[PDB]
Design a protein around this ligand. Sequence first.
Ligand SMILES: [Ca+2]
Ligand SMILES: [Ca+2]
Ligand SMILES: [Ca+2]
Ligand SMILES: [Ca+2]
Ligand SMILES: [Ca+2]
Ligand SMILES: [Ca+2]
Lengths: 301, 301, 301, 301, 301, 301
Amino acid sequence: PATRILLLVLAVIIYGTAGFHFIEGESWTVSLYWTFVTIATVGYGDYSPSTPLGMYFTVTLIVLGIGTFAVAVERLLEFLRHVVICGWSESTLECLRELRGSEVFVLAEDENVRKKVLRSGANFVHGDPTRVSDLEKANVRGARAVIVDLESDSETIHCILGIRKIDESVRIIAEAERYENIEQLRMAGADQVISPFVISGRLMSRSIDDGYEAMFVQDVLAEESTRRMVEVPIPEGSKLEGVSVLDADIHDVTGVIIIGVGRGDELIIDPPRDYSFRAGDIILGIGKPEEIERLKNYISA
Amino acid sequence: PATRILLLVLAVIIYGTAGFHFIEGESWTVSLYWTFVTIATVGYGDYSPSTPLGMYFTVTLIVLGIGTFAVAVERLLEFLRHVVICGWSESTLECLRELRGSEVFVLAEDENVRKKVLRSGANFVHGDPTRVSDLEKANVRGARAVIVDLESDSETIHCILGIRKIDESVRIIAEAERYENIEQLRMAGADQVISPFVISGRLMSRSIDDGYEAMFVQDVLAEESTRRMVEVPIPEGSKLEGVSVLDADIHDVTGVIIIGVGRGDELIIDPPRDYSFRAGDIILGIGKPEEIERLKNYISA
Amino acid sequence: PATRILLLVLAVIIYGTAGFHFIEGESWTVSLYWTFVTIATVGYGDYSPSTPLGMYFTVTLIVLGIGTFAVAVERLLEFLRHVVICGWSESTLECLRELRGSEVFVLAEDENVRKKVLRSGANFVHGDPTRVSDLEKANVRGARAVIVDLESDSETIHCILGIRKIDESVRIIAEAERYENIEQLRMAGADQVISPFVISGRLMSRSIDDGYEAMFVQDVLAEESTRRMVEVPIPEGSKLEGVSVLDADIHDVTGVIIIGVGRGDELIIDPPRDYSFRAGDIILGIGKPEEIERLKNYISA
Amino acid sequence: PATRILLLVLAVIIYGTAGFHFIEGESWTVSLYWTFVTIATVGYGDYSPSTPLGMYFTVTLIVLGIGTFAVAVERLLEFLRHVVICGWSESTLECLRELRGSEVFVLAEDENVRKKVLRSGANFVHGDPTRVSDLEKANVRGARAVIVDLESDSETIHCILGIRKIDESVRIIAEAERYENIEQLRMAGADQVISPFVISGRLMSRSIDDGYEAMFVQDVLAEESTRRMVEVPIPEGSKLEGVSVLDADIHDVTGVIIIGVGRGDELIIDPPRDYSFRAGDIILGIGKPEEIERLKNYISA
Amino acid sequence: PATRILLLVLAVIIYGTAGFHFIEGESWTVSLYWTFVTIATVGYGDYSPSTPLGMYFTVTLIVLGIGTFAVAVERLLEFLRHVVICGWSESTLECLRELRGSEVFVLAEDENVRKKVLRSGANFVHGDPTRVSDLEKANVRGARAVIVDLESDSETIHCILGIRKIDESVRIIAEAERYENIEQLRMAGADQVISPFVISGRLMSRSIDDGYEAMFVQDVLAEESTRRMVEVPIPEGSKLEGVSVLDADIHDVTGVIIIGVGRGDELIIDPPRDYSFRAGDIILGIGKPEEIERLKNYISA
Amino acid sequence: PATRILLLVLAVIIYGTAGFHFIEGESWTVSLYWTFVTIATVGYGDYSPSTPLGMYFTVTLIVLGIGTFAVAVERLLEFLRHVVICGWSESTLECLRELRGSEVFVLAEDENVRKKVLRSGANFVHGDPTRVSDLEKANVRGARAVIVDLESDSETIHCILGIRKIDESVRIIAEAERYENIEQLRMAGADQVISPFVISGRLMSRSIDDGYEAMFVQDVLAEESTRRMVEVPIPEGSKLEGVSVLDADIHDVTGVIIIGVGRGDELIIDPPRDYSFRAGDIILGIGKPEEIERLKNYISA
Ligand SMILES: [Ca+2]
Ligand SMILES: [Ca+2]
Ligand SMILES: [Ca+2]
Ligand SMILES: [Ca+2]
Ligand SMILES: [Ca+2]
Ligand SMILES: [Ca+2]
């Protein structure tokens, strides 16, 4: 019915522009040109509608002059490597703050959010991350990875399954509100789970004494003090491949502290001395950018 | 007034047991013995109250027999280095899970909580952590340290000031729900602030790539894989005091990775080579317990 | 993306005005002049777009005529000694009623308020007085003084710290909803605290007898009865400095009852006879304006 | 019906104790003595109810043994110049804090209140102060005066009319939540009206400058600093009656500042010099208790 | 299951009293007499349970001494021409106020009601008048008539159908909350419908002028001024049957104003002069009781 | 600030029309005529703005062409014997249905109402009938009479006092939601009180038997059956004044049943025979319009 009114304002043009070539200077060709020109509150002057009786029909083009302008308006506006964030929460916000330098889409239920999700360098997709149809509104298929944090682990567990139901291989990262659901959250298909509260809690209990243990975690993740925790990959042909951690003395050599090495989906912290670097191996280390750069070279080719 | 009714039920014993040695076999000594015995619906038989007239006074001991039984009941049940946790939240819960091996008191508004705060090795103090009077119900004065996490940073900021208002030196550790209040949370007097959401968010944005950076934080704080992040202090007389990090090769020597050194209230991550250990200095390092033990000795005296 | 649509409505002018100098009287200079003139539903007549084929391109300028007018509208509006009142409550309202003769800004969360905060001689700044960013929207830095009354002492305590966090010297005046928080309210940084309820309550208990005690407080603060409570300062060179209250007989002399003298941040009520006026001293007294004027002179130079 | 069940448990004693002198050793006198003794789970032993057939009737005394014990219990506890406070609010609370040394009854809708209204030296009457029937539950008729503060001026206006509807002369004191209703609050019958917010507001606006004006009001009503605002009456035969305020130099003489004199229902603040004290006159003055005592004597007889 | 536990506490008496005639002085007759006497915390002394081994079985009678006392308690209190009112509202209340002199049952959802429905001379049946099962709890089948007023016409319409579903002939009287449902309320089966609001409204509009029209309705229905609106039936053999209203001059004769005559389910107001009384006819008239009595006789036989 | 933007759109006319007499054909008189003509998307053609450089300033009149049209719009619409109904309820609605043939104003809090209060022949005044300022928005002063029905008797009691506070003589008609407040409702100043529920209730209890008594009230107030309840006044010079009800036989004479006579503010139902009509007396009677007309004449002069 909304597109059925654009037929009445289209008929007024064949009824309003019709009396132009009939009640004035004949021109069945430039008849609509008079109507559109007149209705568009233009009034250039290609026909002042002089006829008196044609002034009565010219008055009709004034009445139905808004029944096509205020009409074709809502009808003209009723046609014409990215990351998706399901759910909009502080976690999400703080996250969107880092991903600022890239294409991010926040899919959320509450519209009121929009305005702010925009104040932060992200695009807003109004929908419910639980409905696959809306997940698609954010194009999860092509999402480099999806971050999920809804109000209740239940809704999150849902959203995940939904995502799976589309691209069953996108990297999904979810926040767990309660420790007791971390596993279900994985079963559902989350690849990585983060439990802000378990971290927070432990850090608390661990800062009753001295708060360095908690000072570490928070400071390291903050873009301050130069020192930066970085994960460096070992190229296929590495002058290390086969070498022992103990033998490479990466610290003495690079200055980059290695807090652990990773074999996709798994990571070891104080890697034992007799550890042997491989190809896909990833180095989790903290260090001055220089040190880092130096570390990359000490491995290159 | 609740303890003023225990004087009426105590006077009924001097009025009920009084007629025993007066309206029966004289015995001002074993008079109360008859009243208590009778009121206790015992009726052993040391005096069947035979007197007819004394049966009228024996009936009074039956009427006021519940005005001392149903009384001394709620009156008998109305008499017979610790950590205080203000607010009961997941963070709090997860925290109370570590502090299990010690005296912990959770002060919260909602009673329904109690039952669970008990299922977890902690004692419950029903009150509002914003009211100083209730803070005192949990004895903050003697609290080794107070952990604070209320529903809204506002209420937390409050609670803190409150605590300050009592022991202006207790170590206060608070969680911040929003990044924008971390500072006010300190001004108010929080010594240590933890923002689960800032951590969570960043870890997220940092795990779009590879999730080791986030795998580290969560795994390190979990009592698994042997490896343990520990903060070891440098005794006053240390065979290191004055020595350079570069010179002590603590890693090669101990095997304990040092992720940073701390000077009370502050911590440096990749301490520069030319750093010189001092007395109060604290070593933040991850390593096998053995390694740790070994690290402590490599410093002792 | 909201500023990326202003490039499409900017391209329609290079595509709509482009066909003007091509499908009509050549004029690559006054081509945009035809498009803008036409799109602005003006139709002066500098070119009636006569060409039939140019009438087809002239119709395109009518269709995309709103895709630049309804566009450049939200884009043109998307670029282009005062007192601040945080929180909007009856207290606040009644207060804004006195400050009518001056620059006042009310900063509040609920928009619905606006309309009324305007009916009262004040400017409205929509924001949350707890967020420093919004405090700044009201320019607390330059605020002569800030009045604070939010729904819960907690939120107030918050707001205060926030203010402190900016101009750590602005005079802050806060209302306390509960007696038990008057101190925390100060610790946080409130300079002056008013507890309407403590006043109200006491006045009540004090008016069970005769209601003069309560009739005084309310009447004195009301702009009626001539009598006015005034605080008069003692100039540096005063013919009183050093004189005893008993000796100056200010009442007999001036007629201005002195209910107390104040030494910045502190005030004494029935100042003892042997009190000696000083320089900065402030006289809190009630009296007929004349009496007052008379009091000022009895001290001048 | 609650007192009609005490006739069934009284008939069981005439039916339970009746079979004792009929189905055992005859004794229509000591028959109830066996029933009461038995029902009271006493079992002294004055009759072991040996009869086998009488053991069937002795069993009936065991069944209806609780139909008289659990009965006469709630029946024994259901029998064995004051001020009424309608509504329970901070104002009210702070007020009840002064009236501690006297008989006060708080009548309120929410039961949850009770416990606290008791922690404060007052008695609680659960009811709605708007329903006359409940007002009567608090005996307004005999109330020395009624204090009224309900959640909304409307409810208060109501409550008042209600009170009027009973003792149309009790001194009613009400708090007004909004300035715009102070008059209706009076029309309804309130004798004294207190608007905590109008006071609070004004004090605020008045403390932007220096806060003495607000320091006065709050401090004077506080039982401190010794100084106490008192209203002293002029006895019938006074060595002042007829004397001029100017002539009595009460301040110089007593030390008690007189902030105003009152002629029932009315009070003048800086009484003009040519004022003449009368009989019923009341002196509103602030001063050290000694000063006060001294003031009373300077008038006695 | 609640009555299945009274079989376990009944088996403990055949198991507890069984060891009495087995582990003591033989008496299979007075065995239960020992168990009941012992379990009733009586201890008269007809058997002190002396046997040591029988003291082990006498201890079992002490353990299961509460598993029959605390049991038979809630089991002893769990056994020991009327009008039904569905829904409890002011209308209902005001109605129950008239029906005070008779058997009335109020069936309602909210339990909190009970206490009051009892303060008014009625019995309370806790249930939902929409559920037939609960309608039956109030025995509508035998209800002289059912009055229905639930919160929403919808629920009422429901309740009615429900009632119909049982006694499809009980006189149902329902209140309609909205004028627009009076008919549906009848279709559903209400026999009589009352719309307090339509009455109220009209009376209002009719009392803008003079309020007699509204003074009539309210006063007539109030048990005051002697005058009473009464409906008197015309006996089968009446000295009026066939007589004209004009001819009977009932007013002049009786003094009872006849405001209308009724033919079951219908009533005419100013019956025309030429009206002829019949048998079942009912006379709606107002008049002094005497007048009424006089009217009854002027028709008798 | 809303009227401060009309100075910027007024300055654009002195800045936009200014370049017309400077960058075109000089005419400081008809300069604003070009601006207003241009901004009004008129484009008559009195100046096509030919100048190229003036086309750059002519473009500025296109940009700021909406900053005066979309402005002066909300600024042009932001300047340019009756009955008042306080509160909008079914009662009210049903009432407004009768008063259809007259000037009625409904003053209510909820805006959503408006639309409907209009569908019914009444004018809507959005405000709170409790605030005198809004009562005045409906001009109670001149209200022929005010009808009051708010959600709670409390709010009504309020509203009344408010009304009194303005025209202390307007006829006030109020509905009482609860029987227990009918008196307070009067004390407050209601002149006439209607209790739909008391009526409804009684009618119910009275229709358990036969429902004529309730059929009467509802039918009489309904504009059906010809019969109409009317109140006819006795003119000053009446051929009845002094005559006995018994003597005037108004029924026999007129046919109009007299259900009662009224002496302002009071009404008697079956007026005793020996009653004597007076001047101001009002006759409450039901009867055919003819009968009525006939009744008026039987009294005229
Ligand atoms: Ca979250
Ligand atoms: Ca939390
Ligand atoms: Ca407030
Ligand atoms: Ca209050
Ligand atoms: Ca109803
Ligand atoms: Ca109503």
